[PDB]
Design an enzyme around this catalytic site. Sequence first.
Site, PDB file in Angstrom:
ATOM      1  CG  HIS A  60       6.362  51.094 -52.499  1.00  0.00           C
ATOM      2  ND1 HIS A  60       5.088  51.364 -53.294  1.00  0.00           N
ATOM      3  CD2 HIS A  60       6.288  49.836 -52.415  1.00  0.00           C
ATOM      4  CE1 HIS A  60       4.387  50.173 -53.486  1.00  0.00           C
ATOM      5  NE2 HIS A  60       5.163  49.273 -53.029  1.00  0.00           N
ATOM      6  CG  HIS A  63      -1.015  48.590 -50.543  1.00  0.00           C
ATOM      7  ND1 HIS A  63      -0.153  47.512 -51.141  1.00  0.00           N
ATOM      8  CD2 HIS A  63      -0.504  49.554 -51.412  1.00  0.00           C
ATOM      9  CE1 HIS A  63       0.681  47.899 -51.937  1.00  0.00           C
ATOM     10  NE2 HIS A  63       0.498  49.150 -52.200  1.00  0.00           N
ATOM     11  CG  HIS A  90      -2.728  51.858 -54.055  1.00  0.00           C
ATOM     12  ND1 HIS A  90      -3.062  50.422 -54.550  1.00  0.00           N
ATOM     13  CD2 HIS A  90      -2.197  52.396 -55.060  1.00  0.00           C
ATOM     14  CE1 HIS A  90      -2.695  50.603 -55.764  1.00  0.00           C
ATOM     15  NE2 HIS A  90      -2.439  51.707 -56.137  1.00  0.00           N
ATOM     16  CG  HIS A  92       0.284  55.935 -57.166  1.00  0.00           C
ATOM     17  ND1 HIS A  92       1.608  55.357 -57.111  1.00  0.00           N
ATOM     18  CD2 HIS A  92      -0.814  55.313 -57.407  1.00  0.00           C
ATOM     19  CE1 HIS A  92       1.014  54.040 -57.400  1.00  0.00           C
ATOM     20  NE2 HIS A  92      -0.353  54.076 -57.556  1.00  0.00           N
ATOM     21  CD  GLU A 102       1.047  55.837 -60.602  1.00  0.00           C
ATOM     22  OE1 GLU A 102       0.293  55.042 -60.691  1.00  0.00           O
ATOM     23  OE2 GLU A 102       2.398  55.488 -60.388  1.00  0.00           O
ATOM     24  CG  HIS A 115      -4.497  53.546 -58.837  1.00  0.00           C
ATOM     25  ND1 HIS A 115      -3.083  53.560 -58.950  1.00  0.00           N
ATOM     26  CD2 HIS A 115      -4.882  54.719 -59.593  1.00  0.00           C
ATOM     27  CE1 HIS A 115      -2.862  54.162 -59.983  1.00  0.00           C
ATOM     28  NE2 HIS A 115      -3.666  55.227 -60.200  1.00  0.00           N
ATOM     29  CB  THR A 195       1.592  52.300 -62.152  1.00  0.00           C
ATOM     30  OG1 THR A 195       1.145  52.169 -60.663  1.00  0.00           O
ATOM     31  CG2 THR A 195       0.379  52.767 -62.949  1.00  0.00           C
ATOM     32  CG  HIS A 196       4.406  48.899 -57.901  1.00  0.00           C
ATOM     33  ND1 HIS A 196       3.395  49.471 -57.318  1.00  0.00           N
ATOM     34  CD2 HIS A 196       4.519  47.696 -57.510  1.00  0.00           C
ATOM     35  CE1 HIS A 196       2.853  48.550 -56.333  1.00  0.00           C
ATOM     36  NE2 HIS A 196       3.875  47.490 -56.492  1.00  0.00           N
TER      37      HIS A 196
HETATM   38 ZN   LIG Z   1      -1.562  52.512 -57.980  1.00  0.00          ZN
END
Ligand SMILES: [Zn+2]
Length: 256
Positions: A60, A63, A90, A92, A102, A115, A195-196
């Site tokens: 998804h 990293h 990583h 988004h 995000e 992030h 966040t996941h």
């Molecule tokens: Zn993140």
Amino acid sequence: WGYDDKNGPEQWSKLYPIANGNNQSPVDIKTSETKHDTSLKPISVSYNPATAKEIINVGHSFHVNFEDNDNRSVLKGGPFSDSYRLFQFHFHWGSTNEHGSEHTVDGVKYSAELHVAHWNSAKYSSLAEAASKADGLAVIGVLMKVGEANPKLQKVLDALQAIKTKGKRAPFTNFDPSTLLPSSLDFWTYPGSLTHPPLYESVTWIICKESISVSSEQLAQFRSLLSNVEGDNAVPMQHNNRPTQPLKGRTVRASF
Ligand SMILES: [Zn+2]
């Protein structure tokens, strides 16, 4: 879980009840409601390029991980009293330039978000132990606004061709991620979560006021990474950002 319609953010609560918690991230930062705090000190980052270790395609997203056996690379200052140890960074992004970040500021969405994650090595012995503690993690978030190409993203982007499909990994060394942060380190901070999944409410967020740039073509490189394993029909990584969540009474503090 995923970001698709069937197993996406809106459905995560089924398997992870904490998704409807009172300390969930990301959130929308309303500048008229932020509380200035003179108790906040400047953010201080000191990373050793020798700690960079590997880049991995996780289906998804991707990293970049760092060796975290000692304090060669740490984060200090801000709302912290303890030093946090760097372990990964990583990004988004969204399906088009219109969305992707995000966190949002005054309702404005950006094209992507960086992030940089750390864990509390002053109080805990490892990432696994710290991940579930309220004061266990610290993540710096930087909004990425589409515009001119960002040369500082070069090494990262050039490395993707070696980890195109899910599960692939390769050495990623001699890199200091502080070169990706904006010139000004003024920030907002609030108590939040991952966040996941598992969505643990163990993150103290540090959101930078100043954004960094990224071109439409660089964003296309993120979206061209594949979520399938080698051999299967190619399925591009279109998006991986979670919608903003209810503040539920939390207070966002500003260092400026
Ligand atoms: Zn993140």
